[PDB]
């Protein structure tokens with residue numbers, strides 16, 4: 001069939017690649033002059049920074065994203081973090097396993113697939129099931145900030161449980177050789193080698209459901225059998241037209257408030273300081289940081305190591321937050337020199353048009369693995385793809 005993809009972000013390119021591979025006619029329409037959206041590279045002062053993800057995948061080689069890339073025929077080198085993760089507490093960075101020493105479990109239950117019937121905040125359920133441990137609640141707060149850009153109290157016990165299940169199933173994160181762009185380049189190649197088209201500088205202004213045609217600002221017409229939107233729920237509703245949605249759904253969409261985050265790109269002189277791993281920072285505004293060049297050295301500038309820290313903004317003041325961000329990094333990395341700070345239920349009702357990308361991350365799906373999980377679900381909903389429940 002004919003599929004028109006609106007937006008060339010990770011979700012859009014994954015869907016386009018999968019469908020093109022399966023013999024469908026794919027046309028990707030990208031508004032900007034470059035593809036990749038918030039999952040590609042940003043050359044900057046001799047460093048390969050990113051437009052979003054920290055050149056890392058939440059579950060590395062083991063999650064939904066890696067699986068999708070493998071079955072698509074993408075050749076991308078993803079290496080899981082040495083220890084799955086580490087923690088910075090009371091002046092020391094240690095292996096996550098050491099954490100138990102701060103305690104006097106339910107992971108076994110989550111392993112058994114048994115999730116909480118409880119409908120209470122995640123911080124509340126942790127206190128009850130485990131206890132009010134000042135260390136644990138602090139680390140889980142960093143996890144929530146890093147993986148979901150919210151406070152632990154902002155997650156339901158069920159959501160945290162599902163993310164915990166995902167971690168037990170697919171393990172820790174992994175770095176990408178070549179950065180995020182490596183993935184983008186492969187998806188672009190797969191689409192082009194499978195009869196697909198990728199048109200940049202094509203801004204979609206209307207997804208007409210009745211005519212089944214997509215219109216661009218420059219008046220070009222593209223008819224479709226299926227349309228895949230990688231532009232987010234709110235914008236997609238606008239492109240289609242509000243009248244095509246139920247009143248209560250429009251209420252939910254108009255109520256969506258994106259959770260902002262701040263990224264700190266730090267140029268530390270010398271050799272890698274942490275290697276292929278992530279470091280949670282309980283107690284700080286920053287939630288954690290990684291060292292992408294620990295795998296691909298070309299990502300950093302000569303004689304330098306690239307450090308990327310993530311900070312969930314919440315209701316923080318940008319100027320103050322950025323300042324507090326560099327302050328904490330100065331304390332952790334005295335020789336570090338600031339490079340750039342970057343600032344970033346009713347289900348979808350239609351079937352001819354579906355949404356993929358950050359606007360659709362199924363429960364338990366973290367960041368880009370969450371994006372990939374959404375693409376899998378969309379494909380199944382279209383009865384155009386089938387995936388093991390090990391990934392769903």
Ligand SMILES: Nc1ncnc2c1ncn2[C@@H]1O[C@H](COP(=O)(O)O)[C@@H](O)[C@H]1O
Pocket residue numbers: 006007008009010011029030031032034035036037038039202203204205230231357358
């Ligand atoms: N109206 C539009 N038509 C086509 N592409 C768009 C439109 N709005 C946003 N985009 C692109 O959609 C992509 C979504 O990227 P991301 O936010 O990473 O999913 C970006 O590459 C945007 O430039």
